[PDB]
Symmetry: C2
Subunit: 399 residues, 2 copies
Amino acid sequence: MQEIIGASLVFLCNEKCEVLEDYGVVFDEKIVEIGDYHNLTLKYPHLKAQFFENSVLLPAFINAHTHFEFASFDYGSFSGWLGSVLNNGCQGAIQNAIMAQLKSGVGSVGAISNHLIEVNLLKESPLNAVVFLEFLGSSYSLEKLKAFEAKFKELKDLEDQKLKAALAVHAPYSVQKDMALSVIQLAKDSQSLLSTHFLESLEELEWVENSKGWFENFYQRFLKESNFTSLYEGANDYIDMFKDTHTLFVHNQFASLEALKRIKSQVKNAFLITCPFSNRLLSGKALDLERVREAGLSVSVATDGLSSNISLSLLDELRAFLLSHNMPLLELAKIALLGATRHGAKALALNNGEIETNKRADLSVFGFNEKFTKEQAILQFLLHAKEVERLFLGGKRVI
Amino acid sequence: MQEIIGASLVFLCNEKCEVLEDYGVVFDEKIVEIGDYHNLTLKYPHLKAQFFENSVLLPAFINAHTHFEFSNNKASFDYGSFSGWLGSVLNNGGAILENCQGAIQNAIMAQLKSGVGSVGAISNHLIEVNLLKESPLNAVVFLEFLGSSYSLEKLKAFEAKFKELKDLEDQKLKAALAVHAPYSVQKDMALSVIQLAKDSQSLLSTHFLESLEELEWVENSKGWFENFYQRFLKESNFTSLYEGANDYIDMFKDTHTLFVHNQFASLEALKRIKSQVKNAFLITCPFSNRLLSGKALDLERVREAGLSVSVATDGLSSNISLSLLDELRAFLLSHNMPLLELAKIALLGATRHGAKALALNNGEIETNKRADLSVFGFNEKFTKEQAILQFLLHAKEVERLFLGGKRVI
Ligand SMILES: [Fe+3]
Ligand SMILES: [Fe+3]
C-alpha cells in the first residue's frame, strides 16, 4: 500500500545536499512523491500519515565495506597488525552484527566474504546486500582458480532482489597478477562489481614501487612461498588491470595524486571508499581529502570490519571521520552525509541513498529533543545521531 | 582498614609510564605498598584480597576542565566557528542555565562511571558546588570571572562570592579562581582576581588563545572582535584590553595557572608561558577544538617549548559526552603523532599530569598517594606492548572505582 511520512528536517542527500523543513514523502515499495507534509496530507487525505517533530528523515545508510568474518590484533602499525592477523593463521556474532547496522540506520551493506558464512543470514535480514567474494592468493594455482570460480557459482545461485553477487581482489601484496586477471575477467563475464584494498599502508607503497620494505620477508615467514620481488611492477601496473570496470578502491591513504588521477582516467567508474577509524589503528595516516578532490574523485565512508575497529555503527565512524580531517567542519559534514548515502549507493550501484522519485523506499527517521537550525541540521545530526527511531526498507517497517 | 587488589595489568601512570603484570596494591586511605600480587598475598595473609583477570588497574582519572553549569545543552549552540559559537551563546543570554541541578547530577555520573575521581570544575554562580559535595568526587572549584569593563562594585560582589566558596571547602573540595579569557576580562579586573588568588593561595585557570579570532584581536586589534563589545555586551570598546599576547601572560607570572586550549599560541607564546608563569599547566580539549575553532593543538609545538598537556572534556556547551574515555579516543584521532607514543600522552594527560596541575595527591600508583584507583574489566589479556592503547579503545564503563580507599562504584 501507500503511506506518508514527514519530519521537521528532511535530508534529500542530493549532490546539492539540500535540507528541507516540515517536508513529507509518500512511498510504497519506491518513493513516489515529495513535498510539504501538510500539503501532501490534503492531496492524499486517506493515506496513513505520520509526522515526527524535532526529527530528521533521511535515506537509509550504505556501508560499502564491512567484513562480518570477525581485542586480539595489534594496533599502531600495519606490519604489526598484519603480522598479528597472520600469527592467528562466528555465526552468532554475525546474527547480532547485522543488528548493529539496522539500529544505526544502515539499510544496504557491501560485505566482503571469504567462505560465504554470513550470506545465508544476510538473506533473511531486511538488509540490501552486495557480497564480494574475496580472492586471496600470491601463487598461481589453476586448481584453486577453479575452486574460486565454483564458490562464485554458489553465490550466483543465491541471488535475490536484495542480494547482488560481486567479487573482490584483496591487495597488491596478496594476489598474483595472473590470478587477478582471471578474477577481473570473471567479473566482466558475470557483470559484477570489483572491490580492492589499494595503497593502505606505507609498507605496501614501498613494496609496490621499489620492491623494498617490510614485504621482503612477508612471503617467506607467513605464506610458505619463496618470493622476494613485488607481484606488480609499480602502482600503475596494478591499476590498469581494473581499466573499464566498476571497481571499489578502499583506503588509498598512500596513493599519490598521480595514482588517483590514473585510477579516475583508467578505471573510468572508480569509487574510493574510506574508513577513518581503521586507518588510525593501522597505517596511522588519514586520507588526504583535498588530494581526493584534486584528482576528481569522491569518497564513501565505511566502518570496515571489527578486524581493525571498535564499533561498526556507521554514525560513530562518521564522527571519527569528522575528527580525522582538518577541513572546514561544516563542509566536511556534508562530505560525510553524502559519503554515507548517495556516494555509497552509487559505488554499490543501488537504487537508494537519495530522497528522489522512483528510488528505493529506504528511509531512516532519527528522533532528537530539539530542532536544529537549517544551517546546522546536517552537522548537529552527525554529532547526536546514535540509534534510529524508525527504519523503512522497501516500504516495509523494520525497526 | 587495609585491603589488597590486583589486576592482570597495572598502569602506574608515572612518567616512565610503566605497565606491570599480575601486580597488586595495598591501600587504606592512601596507597601503602606496590608489588607482585602473589607475593603480597603471602606477606599480608589476613588482608582481604581480590584479583581481577583480564583487567586493568590504574589511577582514577582527573578531568581538569569541565563546566557543569552548562550540562542542559544538547543542540542549541552553533558549531563550525568560534565566532558562530560565542554569538549563539550570547544570543542565548544565559537561558540554558535555568533548571540544571538534575542534569548536573547526570553529568556527575558520567565522570564516576567513566573512571574519573577528581575534576576541576569551572563555575560562575556556584550552582553545582553542593552537588559536588554530595558527591564522592575530588573537586577543585574554579570561580570564574567575566567582565570587560572595570566596575569595583562587581569586583567585591565577586570577592564576596569567593568567600562563600571558601566557606564550603573541606578535604574533598578545594577552592580556586578563574579568569575567563583575554577578550572577556579587563586588565585591572584580572590583576585583582590574580592578587586575590595569591592572597588566598589558590589555583588559577584561564582560557588562552582558543580561536583565530582571539589571536588577531589580542595582537592587532582586528577581526570579529572589533564589533563584539557592542553587539553582546552593551559596552563601547573598540580596542583590545591587552597590548600583545605577553601582556596577558605576564599577569600570571609566579603562580599556578592552568592554561586551557592554547591551539593558537605560537612557540614564542608557549615558551613565554613556561618561563613566566613559572608553574604553568597546559590544558587541551580535543573535541571542543573541532566543533569550535577547528584547529587542534600542535602537540609537537608543546614539547618544543618544554610543556606537557592534560586532556579534559570541557563542558557539553561544545561537546557530546563527558566520558573522559570518549575524549581520549577523540584525542587519539585528532593528532597525527605515532599512535603508540601518543597513547601514553593520553593516559598521562588523564592521570599524573592532571593531578599535578590540580595540585592533588593522586593520578599515580605510588606509595603515600591517595587511594584513587579504577579497575576496568575486559575479555582478553593485552600484550604489555599494546596494553596502554588497547585500554583506551575498549574502556567504556568501570568495574570498580575506589576513591580515598572507599568503594564508590
Ligand atoms: Fe577489507
Ligand atoms: Fe572551557
